[PDB]
Design an enzyme around this catalytic site. Structure first.
Site, PDB file in Angstrom:
ATOM      1  N   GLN C  10      42.279  59.266  33.408  1.00 29.84           N
ATOM      2  CA  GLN C  10      41.083  58.664  32.834  1.00 29.84           C
ATOM      3  C   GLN C  10      40.038  58.451  33.917  1.00 29.84           C
ATOM      4  OE1 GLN C  10      38.309  57.092  31.058  1.00 29.84           O
ATOM      5  NE2 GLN C  10      39.896  56.488  29.594  1.00 29.84           N
ATOM      6  N   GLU C  61      45.907  61.825  27.501  1.00 26.87           N
ATOM      7  CA  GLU C  61      45.331  61.183  26.329  1.00 26.87           C
ATOM      8  C   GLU C  61      44.021  61.860  25.953  1.00 26.87           C
ATOM      9  OE1 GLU C  61      44.732  57.080  27.178  1.00 26.87           O
ATOM     10  OE2 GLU C  61      43.139  57.411  28.653  1.00 26.87           O
ATOM     11  N   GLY C 134      49.504  56.140  35.103  1.00 26.31           N
ATOM     12  CA  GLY C 134      50.690  56.974  35.030  1.00 26.31           C
ATOM     13  C   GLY C 134      50.392  58.455  35.128  1.00 26.31           C
ATOM     14  N   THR C 169      44.039  45.583  36.834  1.00 25.25           N
ATOM     15  CA  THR C 169      44.028  45.620  35.379  1.00 25.25           C
ATOM     16  C   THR C 169      45.406  45.794  34.777  1.00 25.25           C
ATOM     17  OG1 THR C 169      43.607  48.007  35.371  1.00 25.25           O
ATOM     18  CG2 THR C 169      41.691  46.543  35.320  1.00 25.25           C
ATOM     19  N   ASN C 196      38.741  49.522  44.591  1.00 24.01           N
ATOM     20  CA  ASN C 196      37.790  49.179  43.549  1.00 24.01           C
ATOM     21  C   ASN C 196      37.025  47.906  43.836  1.00 24.01           C
ATOM     22  OD1 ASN C 196      38.152  51.370  41.710  1.00 24.01           O
ATOM     23  ND2 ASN C 196      40.065  50.447  40.997  1.00 24.01           N
ATOM     24  N   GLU C 244      37.674  71.517  59.195  1.00 23.89           N
ATOM     25  CA  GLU C 244      37.421  70.773  60.420  1.00 23.89           C
ATOM     26  C   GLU C 244      38.105  69.411  60.387  1.00 23.89           C
ATOM     27  OE1 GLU C 244      35.529  71.638  63.148  1.00 23.89           O
ATOM     28  OE2 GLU C 244      34.945  73.628  62.424  1.00 23.89           O
TER      29      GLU C 244
HETATM   30  N1  LIG Z   1      36.731  53.570  40.736  1.00 20.28           N
HETATM   31  C1  LIG Z   1      37.012  53.703  39.446  1.00 20.28           C
HETATM   32  N2  LIG Z   1      38.284  53.419  38.997  1.00 20.28           N
HETATM   33  C2  LIG Z   1      38.583  53.548  37.684  1.00 20.28           C
HETATM   34  C3  LIG Z   1      37.630  53.966  36.777  1.00 20.28           C
HETATM   35  N3  LIG Z   1      38.203  54.005  35.556  1.00 20.28           N
HETATM   36  C4  LIG Z   1      39.494  53.627  35.672  1.00 20.28           C
HETATM   37  N4  LIG Z   1      39.736  53.327  36.986  1.00 20.28           N
HETATM   38  C5  LIG Z   1      41.001  52.895  37.595  1.00 20.28           C
HETATM   39  O1  LIG Z   1      42.108  53.549  37.011  1.00 20.28           O
HETATM   40  C6  LIG Z   1      43.212  52.675  37.024  1.00 20.28           C
HETATM   41  C7  LIG Z   1      44.191  52.992  35.897  1.00 20.28           C
HETATM   42  O2  LIG Z   1      44.268  54.384  35.694  1.00 20.28           O
HETATM   43  P1  LIG Z   1      43.382  55.201  34.629  1.00 20.28           P
HETATM   44  O3  LIG Z   1      42.735  56.397  35.276  1.00 20.28           O
HETATM   45  O4  LIG Z   1      42.382  54.303  33.948  1.00 20.28           O
HETATM   46  O5  LIG Z   1      44.521  55.652  33.597  1.00 20.28           O
HETATM   47  P2  LIG Z   1      45.460  56.868  34.043  1.00 20.28           P
HETATM   48  O6  LIG Z   1      45.458  57.014  35.540  1.00 20.28           O
HETATM   49  O7  LIG Z   1      45.036  58.157  33.388  1.00 20.28           O
HETATM   50  O8  LIG Z   1      46.897  56.428  33.477  1.00 20.28           O
HETATM   51  P3  LIG Z   1      47.132  56.172  31.911  1.00 20.28           P
HETATM   52  O9  LIG Z   1      46.454  54.917  31.405  1.00 20.28           O
HETATM   53  O10 LIG Z   1      48.617  56.057  31.692  1.00 20.28           O
HETATM   54  O11 LIG Z   1      46.591  57.378  31.198  1.00 20.28           O
HETATM   55  C8  LIG Z   1      42.635  51.278  36.921  1.00 20.28           C
HETATM   56  O12 LIG Z   1      43.320  50.419  37.797  1.00 20.28           O
HETATM   57  C9  LIG Z   1      41.205  51.410  37.382  1.00 20.28           C
HETATM   58  O13 LIG Z   1      41.048  50.730  38.602  1.00 20.28           O
HETATM   59  C10 LIG Z   1      36.351  54.251  37.219  1.00 20.28           C
HETATM   60  O14 LIG Z   1      35.503  54.621  36.413  1.00 20.28           O
HETATM   61  N5  LIG Z   1      36.042  54.120  38.559  1.00 20.28           N
END
Ligand SMILES: Nc1nc2c(ncn2[C@@H]2O[C@H](COP(=O)(O)OP(=O)(O)OP(=O)(O)O)[C@@H](O)[C@H]2O)c(=O)[nH]1
Ligand SMILES: Nc1nc2c(ncn2[C@@H]2O[C@H](COP(=O)(O)OP(=O)(O)OP(=O)(O)O)[C@@H](O)[C@H]2O)c(=O)[nH]1
Ligand SMILES: Nc1nc2c(ncn2[C@@H]2O[C@H](COP(=O)(O)OP(=O)(O)O)[C@@H](O)[C@H]2O)c(=O)[nH]1
Ligand SMILES: Nc1nc2c(ncn2[C@@H]2O[C@H](COP(=O)(O)OP(=O)(O)O)[C@@H](O)[C@H]2O)c(=O)[nH]1
Ligand SMILES: [Mg+2]
Lengths: 50, 426, 427, 426, 409
Positions: C10, C61, C134, C169, C196, C244
């Site tokens: 995501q 997803e 995950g 989160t 973050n 590099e």
């Molecule tokens: N820097 C940044 N971090 C993000 C953003 N969106 C989600 N995250 C981070 O992603 C973490 C969780 O993973 P996600 O990418 O949202 O979900 P995933 O990695 O695909 O894992 P699943 O929920 O099981 O599908 C959270 O702790 C957020 O800190 C974003 O737009 N910018």
């Protein structure tokens, strides 16, 4: 499960997908380099002769 | 793709589900006739989770009504949005159990449950990728408790790898509608702890308390209680139906809130829920949603969590919000009141945001907390169970149907070790 | 020369949505894919006047992928690139690494193969993932495993999002971070950390945005990547490539974790009243108020640093500025390294996108350094991961998927061994 | 081109045929006065299969009504679509058999069968390329069963190469109208196994059961049951009358479903069949049609096919549909339910698609399964037959008419050897 | 130079109904087609759909042959009983079609072997054509039944009994399944619910790509006599896998960068074969590559080099030069209502290998199982056959299996 394990170990043994072409193309280029070098050495020897 | 089949049992299940299907269909812009009349294209993208297109805009809900007396079935087809259910999904007995868990689990269940199973099979294979099942019922009655619990056990041994929600109101001494409430609740909970993936505890006492203080309603009929419960159910599964900045699905919530396979009883609350007299004086920001969320007088159970400890907690936010604000509010409420949280788990709160508010509000939230204070209900129910069973009250209506005495002793032991095991992790 | 960029999860593909937005707005391409030669590193040309990005969005997803399929850039991305699963791993490393990962990563591989085949002088890959989830954790590590056995010699720039110390989160993310690093250690060649809370503090103080969403976070990440690929896309007075960084910044084959920063992150109003030159942005790139990972290099010692410079920058003052940094004593370099810097200047300024909150600045610096303060973050993760593991909380989900107790203890001692490794190189 | 001559016998045959010619005349757009009034061009070019142009656009059916009692003829002539037949084709005796198979097969047939043969011959050579004959009768009555059976034998002697369809209803003990049902049905089957080309078995239990459960009719008179049987008969000969993406005539279906020459008793089903209250709560897709097709509670015989195995099966589809979905659905049911199908035959399902739906519908289907569960009825009949014949009940009503004891023993012998060959091939 | 096309059966003339639509839409170059056709069938329903269709005036009325009644999925009926009265009228017309012609390259026949008309009178027509002309080529593009997707029941009986004559009568035989084409439309064309019309449209594309060398001038032309040498190393091994590229939708086509290198690759993966078989189990004996449109000989030359140096697929030990290329200038045309987008260049590959030896072996068990219990045999025997020809057709396919195994070694 046993077939899956054999698949993974054979997959690790091939050393990658692109491995075969690189080794093949490298030895071919090596053939060309020795041929080029041999020509220059021959030229020097024949020049020495004259 | 991700799909939820809905099952309503007993009278309690039918009214709860009735107001529920009105709320969802109104969110997706489907009129009582069942034809699409909405405007936004976003409302059409995610109707496969709850509905099936029949023909010419006709959307039918993916629900199954199951009961024993036809009064509830006719009351459903009479009201609005009653003409949308497929009449074949009204799988239905005729005799009636009548607040007898043994009649609901051994006599009438044995000939109705094959029918309700066959409908569920068609509804499950009609779709492609099951996310889970959704069952709403009560724990005091007979046709909801015993039959519904048997349905849960049968389904769990059929599809063991899918989630399953059950929303159950539980009896309490202050709201005592029937006399054998503990004999029904104790046997029902024994089966729920070994079959259901996660349960969401409800009660009628807290709902009456919510309608008095927060809603300030004059005449809180059952329609308003079912309205609150429906808003909660829509709020938790909003993530599958709408996109957002941080999506959190049902399985994602289950693994994030359940630390041990037996600790799956949650208390739920919903915000904002304000009276029309004070809804005009209010503001809509993240801190005002949180400090109304985490208030103890807003929980939908009569189990005050500050009499225990929080294991984990979760908040599902809806509306255009700033994720920084969401996380800092959860951080603030966890740092100040650090004693109310478990110690060997940091950051006890799972949080998520979705970008579609419910109609009529600009910003809303939904709280799901897995505290250890839920054991107040288990002790509170088991003593009434003990008080009759030490003296063999009302027993022959259970005994003469097929149940023997060791069923009650085993049920007592499992409920008793469960409240003991909640206390140890406390 | 070409580099392809893969996005997992995501957070991964959301970051890509900001990157490719920035790219087309920089090279003057409309979102539909046509111009009204330097674009060759990222876009391949159909030959009919249409430009297609070298990227594959993939996750488990389908929600976050299908808003992309219907945004403005519906026509920029080739359909096959935007891979999507059917159900999520649900913040469960094992579920993304063994149950659901095993079906989706093979489709991603036989896709990424023909992206590389279309390329000629492939410089490497660069991956985007957040370890807290995950998908980005589980199949991300699985994808890196299979990428190492396929190519090996090609760079794999890992721009990962580590979980913040306090702002989080999810609740099982300590488990996910430890198990993921166990494989991210020996696969990624160059892995950059992006916390973050640090980005949150930058938008709060520097950009003076008091209500930031994920959009602004992803925006400035794309700015750093753009500043890092300008040397590959455009010509400058002193350029570097992506090969590099493999040599000049990582002294030992297991110490590859870099602290990133960028300057100047300045709102629309400070720029009007403030002055831009090379010396002050060379300063501002080092102060911890502008770092992207919550750690303090003041507590650590530097091995080697890297400095991207963009815009109207001459080489005389970048040398004079880095000299002034070495003569200061707030930060110190390792005894074994007398010289600790890798500098680079490129001619093109950073372009701006309408709707973003980044001002049009005349000059900018992107610093990428390596230090030992990174050792404190990894140790900080171990305390709260070990905190819960002893009582076996949340272990039943991962072990029910098909794992055991063995991999927790063996992954735990591997990252524990890494702690001792960082301490002995610092001495 | 290809020609279908129609022959109806007895009360059951006349009333079934009356409803049949009602629905066919509406399909071809012919008015009750005999003149063409349709709209589409498609309805004109293939009416010679069922009609003859007489003079001034008078299209008269190619049918032959046959009985022994005038009540059925007058009721036929009275109702609508009654003034479209040629009065010369109402070949008609005068005395009446009355549920005595001997009367309808030796005594009274002897003076009528001459006149029917005269009419059917003149009506047969009137057309050029005969496809076959189509008979509708019963096996419980006398003038339907006995005379119709004798007519089948004489026709197969004259035209041995032409096809032959027989829609015959069989008696069952749950719906038993006459007392001598076994004596008639057993002797009738003895002649059907050697004379007909294929017989589509029907029964009233399944028909009454279908209108109760699926159609949910309140008062299912013979009109509705005859309406269902007619819809089956229209579906089986839609391929000749309309162009399709894959055609299957009578002979084509016969060779794909009959693996051995004596194994030609079929079960029939029609889809879609839905209640009037639920007609708008459903889709119209190929998978929906298939679920209703392969339901064992949908055959129009009282023989559960899941009590045995299918040898072969056939599905005639009508409507604009994708052939891939047709083959994938047939393959899916062939793999999941592997035990109910014969093993030494792969591909037990022949399929076909026509492009013209029946009037009022979008997509329909007709199922013809040649299963080995049909042997239960023959045993279900033979046990009754032996119960009477062990003790010569009612026997003299037939003996004093010409049948000797060897005829009944021969009928038992043929019934018993038949049920053994179905049991052999299961 | 002209070549005439015969169409037999429900499947044959529906394929032709799409094929001739493409020919008229594509068009002195016309001289090879303008039609020189014959439709023939036993059921009049599909032929008389053409007689009233949009192409009423296009076809001369006599051309559309039609019998009186169908063979009804009965090889014996369509070969011995009903064929005997219509085949003479058909071939005694085709003769005067050839007398109209002067430089006849050959005939090309379209039939499906599952049915009775496509199979039975197909072979019957072929036998009198072989004794009448002998030397002139007859390309037969047949449709064999799929392993798992199937519409009939007795089709194994038909497919074996038809093949016994397809060996020694046709010159060049191209297999085509329905499941493989269904998979193609599902995978590449992303059509999840296809019908027969879409299948017939892309079958016509293959036919057009192999006759375009006669019709239009290319850089390297190839006649029908050329396939006769360059792909059949033995007189009884002529069964060709087919493929096509790029089979692609209207939107994906613009997004992707179609070129010569990748389509030469895409025409070799088993994800794009017109016959459900895996050539990874087999070894390529020979390959033939028709290139249409915007093709220079260099990149086609470079592409065959990369295929030879790959090891995912192997060749027989006999052929170092295992290819036959061919380049034509005019790009492929499109049909309104069709699903294939306009492309500058396309490739139709026709190969020969030992993977085909698997389909016959797969076919054998299904026929064997039914025949052992004598299922459905009484229909064919009463039609005029005996047990002799069932058993002898069985042993003919047994010989063919050993033949492929011997040559493949
Ligand atoms: N820097 C940044 N971090 C993000 C953003 N969106 C989600 N995250 C981070 O992603 C973490 C969780 O993973 P996600 O990418 O949202 O979900 P995933 O990695 O695909 O894992 P699943 O929920 O099981 O599908 C959270 O702790 C957020 O800190 C974003 O737009 N910018
Ligand atoms: N590709 C394709 N195949 C078809 C089409 N129509 C029928 N078939 C194939 O034809 C086979 C059966 O033969 P048909 O052509 O339908 O009928 P027939 O060959 O004329 O034989 P009869 O039914 O006796 O007239 C089936 O297995 C189908 O796969 C079509 O339009 N396109
Ligand atoms: N919230 C809510 N609870 C209800 C409603 N109707 C009944 N109940 C609850 O149901 C309990 C009694 O259960 P009952 O309806 O008899 O269950 P059943 O007989 O098994 O269907 C009481 O404690 C009520 O609080 C309703 O409309 N809303
Ligand atoms: N479906 C249907 N069955 C009928 C009808 N009339 C009679 N039957 C059946 O026919 C059987 C009696 O046949 P009968 O009319 O005496 O035949 P007949 O005397 O030879 O003409 C009974 O079992 C009835 O169920 C009808 O109109 N429709
Ligand atoms: Mg045919």
């Amino acid at each position: 499960s046993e077939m899956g394990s054999t698949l993974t170990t054979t997959r690790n043994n091939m050393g990658g997908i692109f491995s075969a072409k690189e080794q093949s193309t490298a030895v071919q280029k090596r053939i060309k380099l020795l041929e080029n070098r041999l020509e220059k050495a021959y030229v020097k020897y024949n020049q020495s002769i004259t | 793709m991700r799909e939820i089949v809905h099952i309503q049992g007993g009278q309690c299940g039918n009214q709860i589900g009735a107001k529920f299907w009105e709320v969802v269909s109104d969110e997706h812009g489907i009129d009582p006739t069942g034809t699409y009349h909405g405007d936004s294209d976003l409302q059409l993208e995610r109707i496969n989770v709850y509905f099936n297109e029949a023909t010419g805009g006709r959307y039918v809900p993916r629900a199954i009504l199951m009961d024993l007396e036809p009064g509830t079935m006719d009351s459903v087809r009479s009201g609005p949005y009653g003409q949308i259910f497929r009449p074949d999904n009204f799988v239905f007995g005729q005799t009636g159990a009548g607040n007898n868990w043994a009649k609901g689990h051994y006599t009438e269940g044995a000939e109705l449950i094959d029918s309700v199973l066959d409908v569920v099979r068609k509804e499950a294979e009609s779709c492609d990728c099951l996310q889970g099942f959704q069952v709403c019922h009560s724990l005091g009655g007979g046709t909801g408790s015993g039959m519904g619990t048997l349905l849960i056990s049968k389904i769990r041994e059929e599809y063991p790898d899918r989630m399953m929600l059950t929303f159950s109101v539980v009896p309490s001494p202050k709201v005592s509608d029937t006399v054998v409430e503990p004999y029904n609740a104790t046997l029902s909970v024994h089966q729920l702890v070994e079959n259901a993936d996660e349960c969401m505890v409800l009660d009628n006492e807290a709902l009456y308390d919510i309608c008095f203080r927060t809603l300030k309603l004059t005449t809180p009929t059952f329609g308003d209680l079912n309205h609150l419960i429906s808003a909660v159910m829509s709020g938790i599964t909003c993530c599958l139906r709408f996109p957002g900045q941080l999506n959190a699905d049902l399985r994602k919530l289950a693994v994030n809130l359940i630390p041990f396979p037996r600790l799956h009883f949650f208390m739920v609350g919903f915000t904002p829920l304000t009276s029309r007299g004070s809804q005009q004086y209010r503001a809509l920001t993240v801190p005002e949603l949180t400090q109304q969320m985490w208030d103890a007088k807003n929980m939908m159970c009569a189990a005050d969590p500050r009499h225990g400890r929080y294991l984990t907690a979760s908040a599902l936010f809806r509306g255009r919000m700033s994720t920084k604000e969401v996380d800092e509010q959860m951080l603030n409420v966890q740092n100040k009141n650090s004693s109310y949280f478990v110690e060997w788990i940091p950051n006890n709160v799972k949080s998520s945001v979705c970008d579609i508010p419910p109609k009529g509000l600009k910003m809303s939230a939904t709280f799901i907390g897995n505290s250890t204070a839920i054991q107040e209900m288990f002790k509170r129910v088991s003593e009434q169970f003990t008080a009759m069973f030490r003296r063999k009250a009302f027993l022959h209506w259970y005994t003469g149907e097929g149940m023997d005495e060791m069923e009650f002793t085993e049920a007592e032991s499992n409920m008793n070790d469960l409240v003991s095991e909640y206390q140890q992790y406390q | 020369r070409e580099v392809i960029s893969i996005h997992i999860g995501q957070a991964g593909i959301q970051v890509g949505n900001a990157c490719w937005e920035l790219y087309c707005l920089e090279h003057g391409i409309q979102p539909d894919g046509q111009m009204p030669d330097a674009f060759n590193t990222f876009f391949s040309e159909t030959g009919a006047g249409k430009h297609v990005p070298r990227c594959i969005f993939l996750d488990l997803e389908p929600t976050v992928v299908d808003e992309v399929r219907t945004g403005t850039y519906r026509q920029l991305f080739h359909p096959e690139q935007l891979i999507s699963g059917k159900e999520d791993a649900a913040n469960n490393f094992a579920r993304g690494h063994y149950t659901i990962g095993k079906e989706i990563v093979d489709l991603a591989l036989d896709r990424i193969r023909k992206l590389a085949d279309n390329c000629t002088g492939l410089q490497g890959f660069l991956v985007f993932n957040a370890v807290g989830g995950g998908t980005g954790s589980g199949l991300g590590s699985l994808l890196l495993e299979r990428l190492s056995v396929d190519y090996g010699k090609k760079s794999k720039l890992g721009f990962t999002v580590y979980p913040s110390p306090q702002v989080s989160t999810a609740v099982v993310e300590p488990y996910n971070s430890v198990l993921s690093t166990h494989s991210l250690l020996e696969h990624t060649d160059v892995a950059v950390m992006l916390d973050n809370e640090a980005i949150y503090d930058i938008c709060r103080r520097s950009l003076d945005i008091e209500r930031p969403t994920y959009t602004n976070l992803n925006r400035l990440i794309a700015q750093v990547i753009s500043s890092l690929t300008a040397s590959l896309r455009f010509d400058g007075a002193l350029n570097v490539d992506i090969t590099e960084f493999q040599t000049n910044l990582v002294p030992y084959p297991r110490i590859h974790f870099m602290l990133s920063s960028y300057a100047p992150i300045i709102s629309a109003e400070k720029a009007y009243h403030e002055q831009l030159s090379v010396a002050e942005i060379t300063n501002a790139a080092f102060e911890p108020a502008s770092m992207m990972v919550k750690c303090d290099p003041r507590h650590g010692k530097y091995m080697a640093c890297c400095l991207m410079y963009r815009g109207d920058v001459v080489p005389k003052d970048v040398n004079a500025s880095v000299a002034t940094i070495k003569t200061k004593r707030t930060i110190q370099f390792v005894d074994w390294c007398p010289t600790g810097f890798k500098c680079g200047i490129n001619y093109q300024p950073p372009t701006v996108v309408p709707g973003g909150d980044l001002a049009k600045v005349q000059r900018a610096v992107c610093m990428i350094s390596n230090s030992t303060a990174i050792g404190e973050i990894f140790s900080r993760l171990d305390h709260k991961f070990d905190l819960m593991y002893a009582k076996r909380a949340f272990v039943h989900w991962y072990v029910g998927e098909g794992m055991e107790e063995g991999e927790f203890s063996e992954a735990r001692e591997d990252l524990a061994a890494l702690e001792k490794d960082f301490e002995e190189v610092g001495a």
